[PDB]
């Protein structure tokens, strides 16, 4: 029978006022004989009516994928409101219900520190500029890098790790040619998190 999977907005979309956060009810294993799906949506128990159904997609295993998308307000999501999707279908003896929301728990401001390459890394062709982000809750976060108004894309960021005080930390490492570092260039770590002033901080880093 059909199965339902419900996904939160992308952290960034909830955090950038200039973007459009949405929750997404994905229904798989829809039979050819009964492709009709009904969606009911609830925000804290109260039914809303403004969802839109995405175009039906045929799956190479003879089933349909049906998706309903609900747009939401930045503050509603960040206030921890609960979003419920309810799926009815003839191949489904009883309606399936799913709920998500932001992780419950007092939000905590991340502390952002940049760390220059080890004196021991200075021998190599490339160097690691590190951004440590610690003391944040919930774990929803965006980390990016830049120099001179342009994104630096050659970085990798760790998954969030639960720390012994109940908050999270991560590290992000950008790899640059040693010369680019020697050349005095200033590099920036951009972090977006709900509990920061204006949901945004930036820490810079250069050879001294």
């Amino acid at each position: 029978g059909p199965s339902v999977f419900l996904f939160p907005p992308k952290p960034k979309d909830t955090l950038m006022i200039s973007r459009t956060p949405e929750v997404t009810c994905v229904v798989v294993d829809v039979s050819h004989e009964d492709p009709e799906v009904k969606f009911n949506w609830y925000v804290d128990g109260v039914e809303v009516h403004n969802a839109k159904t995405k175009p039906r997609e045929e799956q190479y295993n003879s089933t349909y994928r049906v998706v309903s998308v609900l747009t939401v307000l930045h503050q509603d999501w960040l206030n921890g409101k609960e979003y419920k999707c309810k799926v009815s279908n003839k191949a489904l003896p009883a309606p399936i219900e799913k709920t998500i929301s932001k992780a419950k728990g007092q939000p905590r401001e991340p502390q952002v520190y940049t760390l220059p390459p080890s004196r021991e890394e200075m021998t190599k062709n490339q160097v690691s500029l590190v951004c440590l982000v610690k003391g944040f809750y919930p774990s929803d976060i965006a980390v990016e890098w830049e120099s001179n108004g342009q994104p630096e894309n050659n970085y990798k960021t760790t998954p969030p790790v639960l720390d012994s005080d109940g908050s999270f930390f991560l590290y992000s490492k950008l790899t640059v040619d040693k010369s680019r570092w020697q050349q005095g260039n200033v590099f920036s770590c951009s972090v977006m998190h709900e509990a920061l002033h204006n949901h945004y901080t930036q820490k810079s880093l250069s050879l001294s």
């Binding site: 950038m16 108004g149 342009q150 204006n198 949901h199 945004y200």
Partner: peptide
């Protein structure tokens, strides 16, 4: 005040 990210508006209090 307002924060921006690569020219794009993040948030204003």
């Amino acid at each position: 005040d307002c924060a921006w990210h690569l020219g794009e508006l993040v948030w204003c209090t």
